[PDB]
Amino acid sequence: RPEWIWLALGTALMGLGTLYFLVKGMGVSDPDAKKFYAITTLVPAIAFTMYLSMLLGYGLTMVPFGGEQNPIYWARYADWLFTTPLLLLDLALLVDADQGTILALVGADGIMIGTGLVGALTKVYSYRFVWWAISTAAMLYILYVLFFGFTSKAESMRPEVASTFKVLRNVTVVLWSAYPVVWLIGSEGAGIVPLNIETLLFMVLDVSAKVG
């Protein structure tokens, strides 16, 4: 579809989603609350607010041809930090204080999803490549922190069991088996072919970054 899944879904349908998580996700009334389910609107804010601000903002691909090497469409400094790893799991709602959570999982974020965007450039070299693909030389060990987990929430009073993890982690090991690959063929990037593989394919899965 895109346009009008890039820029209709998003803004005008995943906002409608985000009018909102919350018009009601708990809040009781309004969610600073909380730290679950999440964050409500801080991920669903930092997911509508960009995919608005970084929606136009975000249109198609531009910056490489203008000056700076990449950031609109791959924001991804407001699509994969934010939303996405302000909730992949967490990565920054939990970011707890209490040290098991933490920088194992900021280990996943500013470490190996930061290094997963600081990770799509250098546009040669390196850093294109096995820094993001070193992240997926870790998104297997670390995925088997969350696949050691969550056959291991030794840190609640709940089998979340199939009911949230077998959801998320299969969404991960499918829509992030299709969150590292078709951004070769969603611009590795080169400069930039149809352009349709590009972003029009890719952005079917931008959806997943917003929610689901």
Swiss-Prot record:
The chain crosses the membrane at residues 4-23, 38-56, 74-90, 102-121, 129-148, 167-185, 198-212. The record marks 79 as: Primary proton acceptor. GO terms for molecular function: light-driven active monoatomic ion transmembrane transporter activity; monoatomic ion channel activity; photoreceptor activity. Coiled coil: none annotated. Keywords: Cell membrane, Chromophore, Hydrogen ion transport, Ion transport, Membrane, Photoreceptor protein, Pyrrolidone carboxylic acid, Receptor, Retinal protein, Sensory transduction, Transmembrane, Transmembrane helix, Transport. The modification N6-(retinylidene)lysine is found at residue 210. One of its GO terms (cellular component) is plasma membrane. Its main location: membrane. It is found in: Cell membrane. GO terms for biological process: phototransduction; proton transmembrane transport. It is a multi-pass membrane protein. Residues 57-73, 122-128, 186-197 are extracellular. Residues 24-37, 91-101, 149-166 are cytoplasmic. The covalent binding of retinal to the apoprotein, bacterioopsin, generates bacteriorhodopsin. Light-driven proton pump. Belongs to the archaeal/bacterial/fungal opsin family. Homotrimer. This is Bacteriorhodopsin. It comes from Halobacterium salinarum (strain ATCC 700922 / JCM 11081 / NRC-1) (Halobacterium halobium).
